[PDB]
Amino acid sequence: GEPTPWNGTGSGAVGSWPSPKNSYFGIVDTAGFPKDTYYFYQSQWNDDVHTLHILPAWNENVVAKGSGNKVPVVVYTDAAKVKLYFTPKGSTEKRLIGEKSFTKKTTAAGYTYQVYEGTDKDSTAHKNMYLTWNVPWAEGTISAEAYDENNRLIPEGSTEGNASVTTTGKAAKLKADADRKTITADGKDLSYIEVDVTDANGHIVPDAANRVTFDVKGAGKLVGVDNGSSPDHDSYQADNRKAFSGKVLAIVQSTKEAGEITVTAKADGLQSSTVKIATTAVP
Amino acid sequence: GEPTPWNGTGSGAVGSWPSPKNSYFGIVDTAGFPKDTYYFYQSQWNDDVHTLHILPAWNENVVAKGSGNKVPVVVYTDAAKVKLYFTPKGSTEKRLIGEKSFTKKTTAAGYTYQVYEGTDKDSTAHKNMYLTWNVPWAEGTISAEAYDENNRLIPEGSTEGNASVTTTGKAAKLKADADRKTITADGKDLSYIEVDVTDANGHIVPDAANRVTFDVKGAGKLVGVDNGSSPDHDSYQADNRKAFSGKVLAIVQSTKEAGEITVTAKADGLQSSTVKIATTAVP
Amino acid sequence: SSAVDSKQNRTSDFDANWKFMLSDSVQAQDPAFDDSAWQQVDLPHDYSITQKYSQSNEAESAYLPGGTGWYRKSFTIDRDLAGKRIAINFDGVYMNATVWFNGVKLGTHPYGYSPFSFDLTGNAKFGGENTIVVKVENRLPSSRWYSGSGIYRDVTLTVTDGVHVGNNGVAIKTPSLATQNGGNVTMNLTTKVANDTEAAANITLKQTVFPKGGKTDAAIGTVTTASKSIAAGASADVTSTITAASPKLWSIKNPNLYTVRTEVLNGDTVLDTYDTEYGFRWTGFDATSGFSLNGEKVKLKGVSMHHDQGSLGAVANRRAIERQVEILQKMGVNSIRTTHNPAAKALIDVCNEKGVLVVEEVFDMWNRSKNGNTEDYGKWFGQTIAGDNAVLGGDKDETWAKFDLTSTINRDRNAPSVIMWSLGNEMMEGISGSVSDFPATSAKLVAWTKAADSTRPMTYGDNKIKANWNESNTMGDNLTANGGVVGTNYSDGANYDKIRTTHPSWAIYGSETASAINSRGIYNRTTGSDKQLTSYDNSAVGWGAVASSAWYDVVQRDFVAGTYVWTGFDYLGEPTPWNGTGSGAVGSWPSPKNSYFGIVDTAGFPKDTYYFYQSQWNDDVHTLHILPAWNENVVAKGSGNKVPVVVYTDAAKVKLYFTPKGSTEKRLIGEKSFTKKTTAAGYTYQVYEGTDKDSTAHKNMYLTWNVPWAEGTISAEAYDENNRLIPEGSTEGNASVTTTGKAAKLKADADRKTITADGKDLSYIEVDVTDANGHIVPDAANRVTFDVKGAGKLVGVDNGSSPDHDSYQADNRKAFSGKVLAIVQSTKEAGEITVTAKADGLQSSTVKIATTAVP
Ligand SMILES: [Mg+2]
Ligand SMILES: [Mg+2]
Ligand SMILES: [Mg+2]
Ligand SMILES: [Mg+2]
Ligand SMILES: [Mg+2]
Ligand code: NA
Ligand code: NA
Ligand code: NI
Missing domain, CATH: 3.20.20.80 (Glycosidases)
Known part of the structure; x- marks a missing residue:
């Protein structure tokens, strides 16, 4: 609604x-x-x-080009400092685009936050709670590094969000993944299966809307499919739905019988993906 | 063209x-x-x-970083053996990064050449006519020592090229120099004035593009300005030109009367540099 | 702005993104009015300068039309300004402005030259779309010179807390500065504080004096006032005293400036911060020995200057104005009279920073219109202000004359450059009817000025003093009795003497002088055919005098404080x-x-x-400067084909030479030495007294030789009193003139090759037409075409020639006497501007301008 x-x-x-x-x-x-x-x-x-999160996704048919074919690149981070890089298509070497450092603020009660106060900051103060660069488009990869106030790198295994976006190929394959690979056999418990549509190299294709069909067999039932698209009036109780912006979801519910659940996600012209959910009994 | x-x-x-x-x-x-x-x-x-020559320049915004933030460092030399060093910014102590030795080769006719045959040599043969090291980026100075076949150092005074590269500061001053400081007053002869854009310590700033203006006074006149940059359409007859990669040049021509030429190089925000060229009569 | 929000500066630039329409039938005050077909313009803007010349208009005002123009700006006021006060400030609108905000009529303002303001607070939509509308009606004929039309000066918004310093609300006096100089100096301040909230405020002021630009760490005096309760809806004048620790004086050679900052506290917190610019200096006028600054005798070497900026029209562009002052300073000018109307604030700012003394004039005519100009300020001067007219800036209880005078004084009362208020010019000239009412009107203006500002002498420029009118004698005594200074227009030596004899108590000066009339680069006659005039100094209007004469008469007389030569710069009309x-x-x-x-x-x-x-x-x-240019077709041949050669110089001795075409040897033509004269007060000047001196005494302020025509070079050598050469590197002017070839090349140069990328800054590009060897061809009139590429645009082209009717907005113009000008303006993005000047058959010339981002 x-x-x-x-x-x-x-x-x-x-x-x-x-x-x-x-x-x-x-x-x-x-x-x-x-x-x-x-x-x-x-x-x-x-x-x-x-x-450390970067937007936009980096394909020519989804970005916006402003003055000088400059694309507005936005970075959300809690880090003290960010270095922004570019890597040409088919290359292994990146070059430094830019570097910006936050300033730490403290309220009377001790609460702290960060605002960018560099020379090219935004004239609208609240927009400086994040970082923006204008980058000319070109096929390849935009990546970021994050640093703490001691100029020590903050590694990728300690960070959430897309620290890189890259020019993808055409849709090639589905990639399914269950959030919980074992669930209770109580007739209630659910497993959420995220399906991604990616090119040959596992990169999510940012505008993919491929119709994905779910085949569920075993000790469970499909109880929903979703993509979060507001104008999408397809039935939630169908076994198929268009992906939206590269992702589609299926929801499966257990039965009151211990066993396993087999779910295969298929799309036309695409390599299919399968997961398996086991359901454990109750004493 | x-x-x-x-x-x-x-x-x-x-x-x-x-x-x-x-x-x-x-x-x-x-x-x-x-x-x-x-x-x-x-x-x-x-x-x-x-x-004994090293590339690249060693500023963070001009280098290329491959895997592990490693920059490919290349050494061109005719020496038998090279020792490669690093000196952290702020230190006077250099550490050894690596060491490589060439092999001499001789043809039937007796021509000789050198190729690197170490176990870490390039899989493409011709690339072994020089030396490469992958070196992690860090502020400071990369330097090289050359030795002959008898392990005796080859002193700098007998060697050409950049035998060190160092992280520079921001552009601070111009350094002008004329290839010939006395030329003939015949209206034909030229003096070539190279101008370098350097930091406070005299290091050429590798991406300096400051617009340099030339004031010519005395028994000569400015006839060309150049920076060798291909997409630069600025008139060659102007009294100014952007530097390109830290460098710019003025060509001055004598007159048919003997005298003294004075040439001052200026740029907004930077110290100026002045040279004097003697011109001497035809006997 | 496109949007107004926190936190722009307290006062912010409002010049950008307006829409404009010229129509005397449209009614466009409603916010819902469709203005999609209107021009987009940035202010300052002059809509006369873009219209065509027409014989149906008046020569007086450059044959250009005025008309009814409408300006609209739609902008957002963000929700974050909700309880704040908002006002819009106009530094000038010519003329008859009417202002609406979101459909509500705020008020009006007749005078085209005084600053005014309107509170917007009560009608603002906070968190919405807003529309300000300004209707302008320059109904001709309204002026004796080119006025222009529209919003020709800057516009700002002022945003403040409910508790705040009033508009122009600080006055500073240093009455004992002359005595206290070098030690602790007493500053007496008065600050109007307004409480526009619904509760009483406990107010203290924290006032600080520190070097301009400039942090409070380097203050030389501060004070905190005792708490004063100001009631809700009320205001109060708050007196305070600052003891300034040895302030640096503001002088012509070292114009030190301070910022005087006022922080308004209520309870414990700062709600408003008001800065005003100030300089420490004092003056004196004496009947016998003239003017002094900071206790040192100074001669007022002045020019009169009208407001327009040439090819830019009326637009008060800060660089255009700054450039005028620079060119005048190079001439030795130390003072400007703002004939005949308040200046743009920008001029005041420039003179504060450069060390130029300003005599700021407020009015031309009083309550009687001049020259048949039925719509001039003469019609308004004595009218009242409607009670529902919300216009702000000055006193509103008497007439417009009082409003505009106090509005002007309120804006500039703290400016060190301003030394006198001038209340009128030739008030009784060019009008009809009795002048019996003029003494009372004058006394009234004098009383208003005294009450508005006790710190400066008031004056006027009167042209009937030389005619000995009773009204003028009475008016003069009244100025004097109120510590004023009497300016006489166009008196000669003998009349200066008559005034001084007849009125021993008057301190006097030449308030308007010379009115010499000359064109640039004209030599084929030496006296006053082709709509041009000689460049020799032998051409003046009948009531005026040539330059050497009007100066000779002033320099000998210590009791004539100075001169304001008419004019520094040519002006339109x-x-x-x-x-x-x-x-x-x-x-x-x-x-x-x-x-x-x-x-x-x-x-x-x-x-x-x-x-x-x-x-x-x-x-x-x-x-060391020689005239004429030395081409056969531009010189004048008298007896024996002898050409009058003139040298202007401050040297003690000059040797004059000739070099034949193609030779490298020069022969000596003549040699002349000056004589040093000294007045009682210690001023010195030079006159020629050789036995071949001119019979007219003033022409001996310079040198003349009668030289037979011949192709080649005339050149001069300058020597000091000890017979030591004065070398060329220390000397300005043409120290040689030579016979040129035909035009072959253009030569362009920009005055500033780096400018600010603020959409305002200018670069002035002079282009000379020269022969193969670089000599400016003196009569060259080749049509030059400018091609501007990069981060800027051509906003004007000019050659200064009076009969040239070509559009100033064209990309081309004929040179006149070998020179043509192009004016280029920056954008709001840093970059580079490339300008190529071209002419058929000539070599082209290119300049390169860098533009730098605003810090
Ligand atoms: Mg309903
Ligand atoms: Mg071809
Ligand atoms: Mg060798
Ligand atoms: Mg001007
Ligand atoms: Mg002098
Ligand atoms: Na965090
Ligand atoms: Na003159
Ligand atoms: Ni008229």
Whole structure:
């Protein structure tokens, strides 16, 4: 519901049919897939992990080109300092695009946060809670390094979010993954299966909308499929749904019989992916 | 002309304008400033001098980082043996990075040449006419020592090329120098004035592109300015030109009356540099 | 702005993104009005300068039309400014402005030259779209010179807390500075504090004096006032005293400036921070020995300057204005009279920073219109201000004259450059009817000025003093009785003497002098055919005098404090001797449309008399300048084909030489030495007293030789009192003239090759037409075309020639007397500008301008 800016408080569809059916307000979409702003909140709010997230995805048909074919590149991080790099397509060597350092602020009650106060900061103060570069487009990889106040690198295994985006190939393969590979045989417990659409090299293709079909067999039932797309009026109870922005989800529920669950995700012209969920009994 | 690989055989410009308009084929650029490969050829060809040359320049925003943030360092030399060192910024203590020795080869006719045959040699043979090391980036100085076949050091005063590279500071001053300080007052003869854009300590800033302006006074006149940069369309007859890769040049011509030429190089924000050229009558 | 929010500076630039329409029928004050087809413009803007010349207009005002113009700006005010106060400030609008905000009429303002303001707070939509509208009505004829039309000066927004210092709300006095100089100096301040909140405030002020630019760590005095309760909705004048520890004086050679900062505290917290610029200095005028600055006798070496900027029209661009002052300073000028109306704040700023003394004039006519200009300020001066007219800036309880005078004084009361208030010019000239009311009107203005600002003498420039009118005698005594200074327009030596005899108590000066009329680069006659005038100093209007004469008469007299020569720069309009005060063209069309009065033409290119003044006035350089240019087709041949050769110089002795075409040997033509004179007060000047001296005494302030024509070079050598050569590197002016070839080459040079990328800064590009060997061809008129590429654009082209009617916005113009000018303006992005000047058959010339990002 409430699909503002396509909302309507009486009867009748808004814009052409199918009309937006769910909200755009969420940091996370209906399927549980994070939107990019998710990592802004994470850089600001979570003291237990580090954050280094880059937008946009780096394909020519999804980016925006401003003055001088410059693409606005945005980085969400909690780190003290960020170095931004570019790697040409088919290359193994990156070059330094830019480098920016945050300034630490402290309130009277001790709360602390970070704002960018460099010379090319934004004239709108709140936009400096994150970092922005204007980068000319070119096929390849935009990557980032994060540093603490002692100029010590913050390694990738300690950081959440996309520390690199790259020019992908055409859709090649599905990649499925269960969030929990063992669930209770109580007829209630669920397993959430994230399916990604990637090129030959496992890179998520950012605008992929391939129709994915789910085949579930074993000790469980498909109980939902989702992609979080507001205008998508396809049945939640179908066994197939278009991916949206590269991702689609299936939800499977156990039975009251211990066993295993086999789920295969298929799409036309694409290499298929399979997962297996075991269900354990109750004493 | 022939600005391959931006060459065009018919009418119209290639790539965005201003388009490349001189060649890239040259070992030495149009202004007579050598490119790096010059010292490779010197190491192969000139038996009257010794060569010890290192690339790249060692600033973070000009180097290429491969795996592990390792920068490919290349040494061109005619020496039998090279020791490669590193000196951290702020230290006066250098450490040994590596050491490599050439093998002499002799043809039927008796011509000799050197190739590297170490166990870490390149899989492509011809690349072993020089030396490569992969070195992690860090602020400071990379330097090299050369030894002959008897393990006796080859002193700097008998060697050409950059035998060290160091991380520079920001651009601070110009350094001007005339190849011939006394020329003939015949209205034909020339003095070539190279200007370098350096930091406070005299190191050439590798990506300096400061616009340099020349004031010529006395018994001569400015007839050319150059930086060897292909897409630079600035008039060669102007009294100013951007430096390119830290360098720019003025050509001055004498008059038919004997006197003194004074040439001052200036740039916004930087210390100026002045040279005096004597011109002497035809006997 | 496109959006207003925190935190722009307290006062912020509001010049950008307006829309404009010229129509006397449109009604466009509603915010919902469709202005999609209107021009987009950045201010300052002049909409007369873009319209065509027409014989149906008046020669007086450059034959250019005025008209009704509308300006609209739509902008957002963010929610974060919700409880703040917002005002819009106009430094000038010419004329008859009407202002609406979001559809509500705020008020009006007649005078085209005084600053005013409007509070926007009560009608603002916070967190929404807003529309400010300004209707402008320059209904002709409203001026004796080219006025221009529209919002020709900067516009700012002021955003403050509910508790704040009033508009122009700090006054500073240092009444014992002369005595306290070098020690502790008493500053007496008065600060208007307004409480526009709904609760009483406990107010203290924290006031600090520190070097401009400039941090508070380096203050030389501070004070904190005792707590004063100011009631909700009320305001109060808060007196305070600062003891300044040995402040550095503001002088012509070292114009030290301080910032005086006022922080307003309520309870314990700062709510408002108000800065005003200040300089420490004092003056004196004495009946017998004239003017002094900081206790040292100084001669007022002044020019009168009208407001326009040549090819830019009326637009008060800060660099254009700064460039004028620079060119004038090079001449030895130390003072400017703002004839005949308040200056742009930008000029005041420039003179504060450069060390130029300003006599700021407020009015031309009083309550009687001049020259048939039925819509001039004469119609408004004595009208009242409607009670619902919310306009702000000055006192509103009497007439417009009081409003505009106090509005002007309020803005500039702390500016060290301003030394006097001038209350009128030739008030009784060119009007109709009795003048019996003029003494009372004058006394009234004098009383208002005294009450507005006790720290400066008031004055005017009066042209009936030389005619001995009773009204003038009475008006003069009234100035004097109130510590004012009497300015006489166009008195000669004998009249200066008459005034001094007849009125022993008056301190006097030449408030308007000379009115010499010359073109640039004209030599084929030496006295006053082709709509041009000689460049020799032998051409003046009937009521005026040539430059050497008006100076000779002032320099000998210690009781004549100084001179304000009419004018420093040529200006648009009043093209005397082709002037006309009604409708219709004078002489054949195209008729001369700008002045011949200026020492420097509209393009900023000096005429020859520039170097005479420099030889007289600038003690920081030496001068050696020869006229005429030495081509057969430009010189004048008298008896025996002898050409009058003139040398202007401050040297003690000059040797004059000739070099034949193709030779390297020069022969001596003549040799002349000056004589040093000294007045009672200690001023010195030079006159020639050789036995072949001119019979007219003032012409002996310079040197003349009668030289037979012949191709080649005339050159001069300068020597000091000890017979030591004065070398060329220390000397300005043409120390040689030579016979040139035909035009072959253009030669361009930019005055500043690096400028600020703020969409405002300018670079001035002089292009000379020269022969193969680089000599400027003196009569060259080749059409030059400019091609500007990169981060900037051409905003003007000029050659200073009065009969040239070509558009100033064209990309091309004929040179005149060998020179042409192009003006280029930066954008808001740093980059480089490439300008190529071209002419058919000539070698082209290119300059390169860098633009640097705002810090
Ligand atoms: Mg409803
Ligand atoms: Mg061809
Ligand atoms: Mg060798
Ligand atoms: Mg001007
Ligand atoms: Mg002098
Ligand atoms: Na964190
Ligand atoms: Na004159
Ligand atoms: Ni008139």
